[PDB]
Amino acid sequence: DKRRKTLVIIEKTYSLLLDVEDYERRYLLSLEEERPALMDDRKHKICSMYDNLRGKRPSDDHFVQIMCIRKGKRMVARILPFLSTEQAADILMTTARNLPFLIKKDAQDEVLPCLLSPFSLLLYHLPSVSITSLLRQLMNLPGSPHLTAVLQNKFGLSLLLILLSRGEDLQSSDTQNNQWTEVMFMATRELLRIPQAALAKPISIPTNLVSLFSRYVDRQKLNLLETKLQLV
Incomplete structure (x- = not known):
């Protein structure tokens, strides 16, 4: 057509x-x-x-x-x-x-x-606010937020990781706080929710992702993400 x-x-x-x-x-x-x-x-x-x-x-x-x-x-x-x-x-x-x-x-x-x-x-x-907007947009927030289709996709999942990663670079050099922590509590939450099988194979898994999730999750669940994404 x-x-x-x-x-x-x-x-x-x-x-x-x-x-x-x-x-x-x-x-x-x-x-x-x-x-x-x-x-x-x-x-x-x-x-x-x-x-x-x-x-x-x-x-x-x-x-x-x-x-x-x-x-x-x-x-x-x-x-x-x-x-x-x-x-x-x-x-x-x-x-x-x-x-x-x-x-x-x-x-x-x-x-x-x-x-x-x-x-x-x-x-x-891109600065901190832009990364948050991108992640906030990717996750569909403000509007009903879901990402299931994203994690079950090589690019979608790999993009999520690069964004969360860059966000770590800038959040470590320290409504952004509310925006960011929501996007981080949504990220970790949905990341724990998804079954290991449905997760796509990430292209490049950033090293600082362990540190990032260390800020919004306990040791127990943090290990789950490591084994879940070959985190390094």
């Missing part, structure tokens, strides 16, 4: 991507000649890709449709590092907001995991 029309948005945007990747590529392998990067004329293309992913607010429809086609996801995964921190945060927020539905349409293709790396790097430019 409209998959046909959306496919056009993708190709239109894909062409922009290759152009941007071409300049970056040829510039990165010529770091002698010691010449300043000429980005003045390239910049309006990045915004164009962002617009094509959303297009001012606008409903999640435009973006979600794109994130259902195999090429769409692979594309977005490559567009991310070109976007500004805000643009990428919007994409990540919008992804988590509709993640349950995106996992369903990714049943056959299973290409979501290629977004993990791009999002990983994004999280290191």
